[PDB]
Amino acid sequence: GSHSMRYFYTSVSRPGRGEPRFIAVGYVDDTQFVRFDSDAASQRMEPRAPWIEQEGPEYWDQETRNVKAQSQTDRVDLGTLRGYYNQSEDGSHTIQIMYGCDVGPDGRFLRGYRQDAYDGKDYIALNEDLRSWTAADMAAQITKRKWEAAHAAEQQRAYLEGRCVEWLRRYLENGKETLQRTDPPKTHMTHHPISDHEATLRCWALGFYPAEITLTWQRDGEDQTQDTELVETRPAGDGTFQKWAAVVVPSGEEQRYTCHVQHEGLPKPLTLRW
């Protein structure tokens, strides 16, 4: 019932002192809908989902202006942090931002996020109250003091509770056929012998949306966690996701084991046997 919008900004400095590479992506739940790439000749926020193409030129103008504005600040901060930490001129460094908002079923604001990382480590983060920051050590402490004095949190909070939520509700309406859908997983089980004494049972879940899913094993109806493997949920490349779980079993005892699939698109949880 709840839904989320998230933006992911990446600024990567290039060797020497060249202009950093900046990429932004926007997601609603597990569906990407926009991108910006400083290496593209367009230099514009671009649509990446069909239900966003209906936004007019004032939208794309404003999206493009505001992401470049962030990228130009991140580019300067990369230079400053490089000098702050004495990081050699031959070396690449990264500023990342994740931010966005969650809405409930009624479309009301639930929670908001705005957090930054430098070189893969937490740098500064807006706390859940949207009024205070958690900052790392050293340079980020200067940032936290600077942002407190500038009342940045008030401005970030206004975005997260206001425009962020307003526009997520609009995307959820305009892309409702895509975003409010649930595709249940298509499930099957395979059998892979490994010796005369043992065999691997693999439980498959394919073509599901959203990505959240739970696969578990049981033996004789008791939870089975030993000798089990679980792959990271992975994208099929068509808007749906894949996952499998496996267990190594003694030859002849395959029928003691069951696989259990929990997913929002299933009327009730599934059980599979070999």
């Binding site: 926007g26 962030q70 600040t73 300067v76 942090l81 930054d116 340079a139 980020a140 940045a152």
Partner: peptide, 10 residues
């Protein structure tokens, strides 16, 4: 729609 208030970190 992306944020518009841009904070310099340093």
């Amino acid at each position: 729609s992306v944020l518009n208030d841009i904070f310099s970190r340093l």
